[PDB]
Structures are given as C-alpha cells and as structure tokens.
C-alpha cells in the first residue's frame, strides 16, 4: 500500500464493561479498561455500521488510536443501584445498505437494557423500511458499590 | 488534480435540518437525522468551524457509514403539543482567507425564532473576532411533539 | 500540512498541548466559542476524544493551528449564567515512565476555584495510573477560573496535534 487508500471503517466490535471509580471520569476510564478498550481515544459517532463492514472481535488497537465509537454509558453514585448499558447493531439483508447501531443506558438490569437496545435497532430499520437480517447486541450491568459506570460500545475500525 | 483529498481538511459544508417522532429519544434523534437526509452516516460532533475557502453546498451523496465531521444542535421533547426547534447557521467572511463560523441552536420556540437566534449567534462570533461579514446562511426546523419528537439542524463538513 | 485524523486513522497525533481559557458570551455557545478563542484554539474544529495521550507524544506549547483544522481534543468546560458564580475547568496529562505506554488525560470542571479544579484533575490522573498499575513519571496540568458576570464559560483542553 504505497498510496493510502481512503476508506470507511470495515470492522465493528461490540465491547462492554463496568467499573467502580473515585470520580465519574475515573469510573468511565475503568469501564473502558474493563471493556478492553481503555487505552485508546473514543471518538463518539451517531452510530452507523458501514455497508460490508464485518462484526469481529475487538482488534489489537494502537494505544492512543482515534477510534470512531458508538457508545452508551451511565454513571451512578447510588449504592446498590444496578445500572446497565447496551449496544445493538441491526444488520440489513441488503448488503449495499448500512447497519444501524443503537445504544441504551439506564437504571435497569442487563437483560432489560439488551432487550430495549435490540428493539430500538428494529425500530430504526422499520423507520427506514429496510429488511432486517438480524441484530447483534451486547450488554453489561453494574451494581454500584459507591460510584460505578456501565459502558457498552461498538468500536469501528479497519481490518 | 489533488490526491489524498479525503485525508485532508473538509472543503464543503452543507446545512441540513429535520425532525421526527420516535418511540425513544435515540429513535427520535435517528428519525430526525433521516428526515434531514443524513440518517445513514456517522455524525462526529464538532465545535463548528468552516475551513477557509470551503464552500456551502447542497448535501452531497454521502457514502453510508461515512465519518462526517458535523456541528449540530438537537432537542428532544416528550411533551405533547410542545413546539421544539433546531437551527444551524454559518457566517461566511468577506476575507476568504478566514474561516466561516458555524453556530447551532435549539430550544422550545418556533422555527422563525430559532433561525433568528442562530443567525445572531453567528454574527456575534464574527463581532468577537472583528471579522467582516459576507453573509450568514442558515436553516431551521420546528417540530410539534405528538408523543416524543426531536428537532435537528446540522452543518455537515465533507469533500468536493 | 492538512490532515483529517478521522480518515488518516493510521497517523496518530504525536504532540499534546494544554490550553485553557474563559469568556463571557451572549449565549452558551458564544461563551464557549469565546473561551476557545481565549484558550488560543478558537478557529479550529474540535473533535472530542475520551482522553488518551498517544505513546511517545511530546507536551508542547500549542502550535499555530491552521483555521478549520480537525483537532482531536480532550476537554472539559462549564458554562454558568449565575452572576458572581466562580466556575473552573482543568486538564491533566499523566505521563508514564515507560514511554511505550500511553499518557492519561483527565478533565474536570465545576463551581470551584482554579486551584481546587487543578488539584482534583491531577488526582484523577494519578488514580488512572494507579488503576492500571503503571509507573507515573509526572502530571502536567493547567486550569482556569472564570467569575461569571452574566454568562461565562471556563474551558480547559489537551489538544492532540502533529510535529
């Protein structure tokens, strides 16, 4: 590749994690680290999986990389409160179309968050009137001890 | 002919706006993006600055999933009958070596008020810089909430 | 000279610059805009990052950025329309002893003094390194405080750039 070819991300990786922290940002950083995406820069995106992009396990990312990432997170300082974050990726039957990435966060269980985010993806496809192939999702819940963060993401990268 | 153009700074800006009801805030937001014509690309929220010599152009054909540097304003409301608006403006300088200022606004007001407000914000930015104004281009959108709606306005940066 | 970090994903910033500023404004966005200008980073496109300084990146005074530049920036800001209210924003960059490791960028803003904001953000950076169990070389930080007259914004950032 003697000449860098412009391209849209072609991989999407679903990760999720949670962590306690002394401050909201430290808990967030902890959640990222727990999710396996803690030493890279997350560039928040509105969430669209580029056509022909493949869902793959999180690639080995260069530290400090500017990773276009669709994510949802929630931080709580209420002891005993269970918080969750979930990400869904609606995949089209028509491969020339894009996938839809939805995120959800709330004071609920992992199961509810995942169900809600998957439903949101479905709704997005209905709004577009696109044929839905399937929905891939991930979710995580965290029971706050003192200060915790639940985080779920779809990291877009290049294979 | 310039190569690696996409690896350089965006040279176009497109003002788009839209609104939509949604079963959830994000679904409403997604609907507004779709209604605005940029629902199938990735919006990368930016602080809002039109690169010098860039041109305001109608929304180009964007590749789905594109990482579009976008300055935007949006408002979501679940209050039936409430009118919410979003507007975007870009102040273009007379001195073409200078950058354009992109301002975004949102609120519980009419399309007219949102646009007037966002235009003044762009003008003020130029006043703060002491830059001579060529013109201010803007667009606004209002949405009367039925159950849960989102009004959205954006300045999408892209390439020639 | 021009670069879109979102497209040139393979080209990571190799410098980081701490800037801070504050400003009054007729609207929250105008105040925010005024703060960027006061911080010296007012005519560029800020792409917010989560806050990781790429390994081997050097802390340098903010370079002359071309207008409209897409600048990956870790930042914190606070806007207030309460007269007399003192607001602050601070940024810290924890630098590792092992240069092959990344630096951690923490941001903090609140209704407090410049001194408190900086102390807090510095502690946050220290905590980040302790959570990783990495050897901390030092913490570079900056803070700014603004006493709101009508509507003000305090802004602090770690702008990632190239050299």
């Amino acid at each position: 590749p003697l000449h860098a070819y412009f391209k849209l991300p072609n991989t999407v990786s679903l990760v999720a994690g949670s962590s306690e922290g002394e401050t909201p940002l430290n808990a967030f950083d902890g959640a990222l680290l727990n999710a396996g995406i803690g030493n890279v820069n997350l560039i928040r995106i509105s969430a669209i999986m580029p056509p022909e992009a493949e869902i793959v396990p999180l690639p080995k990312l260069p530290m400090g990389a500017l990773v276009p990432t669709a994510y949802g997170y929630i931080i709580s300082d209420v002891p005993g409160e269970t918080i969750s974050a979930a990400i869904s990726v609606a995949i089209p039957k028509d491969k020339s179309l894009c996938g839809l990435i939805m995120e959800y966060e709330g004071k609920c269980s992992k199961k509810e968050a995942e169900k809600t985010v998957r439903e949101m993806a479905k709704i997005g496809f209905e709004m577009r009137g696109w044929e839905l192939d399937r929905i891939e999702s991930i979710a995580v819940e965290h029971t706050v001890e003192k200060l915790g963060c639940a985080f779920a993401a779809a990291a877009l990268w290049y294979k």
Side-chain angles (χ1 to χ4, degrees), chain A residues 74-85:
Chain A
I74 181 174
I75 301 173
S76 169
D77 59 352
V78 187
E81 186 172 75
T82 294
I83 60 181
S84 292

Side-chain angles (χ1 to χ4, degrees), chain A residues 2 4 36 39 48 60 70 84-85 87 99 108-109 114-115 125 134 146 148-149 151 159:
Chain A
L2 302 176
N39 295 316
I48 288 293
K60 303 309 167 192
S84 292
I87 279 281
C108 63
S109 74
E114 185 154 16
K115 170 186 166 59
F125 256 63
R134 69 183 190 278
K146 186 184 179 184
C149 171
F151 167 88
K159 181 189 291 292

Side-chain angles (χ1 to χ4, degrees), chain A residues 62-143:
Chain A
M63 278 194 187
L66 308 184
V67 188
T69 304
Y71 65 84
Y73 72 99
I74 181 174
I75 301 173
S76 169
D77 59 352
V78 187
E81 186 172 75
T82 294
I83 60 181
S84 292
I87 279 281
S88 63
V89 177
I91 305 169
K93 285 190 172 174
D94 184 339
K95 302 306 176 181
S96 73
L97 303 180
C98 65
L100 176 61
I101 302 168
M102 284 289 170
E103 52 98 345
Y104 181 75
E105 21 56 71
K107 308 167 184 179
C108 63
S109 74
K110 173 179 173 179
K111 298 172 188 174
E112 187 189 315
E114 185 154 16
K115 170 186 166 59
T116 310
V117 80
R118 290 182 64 85
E119 183 59 44
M120 292 168 68
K122 176 179 180 178
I123 293 168
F125 256 63
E126 295 174 335
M127 295 184 72
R128 291 167 169 75
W130 292 356
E131 295 180 280
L132 180 66
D133 165 36
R134 69 183 190 278
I135 298 175
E136 300 272 346
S137 54
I138 191 171
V140 67
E141 64 167 46
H142 184 84
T143 302

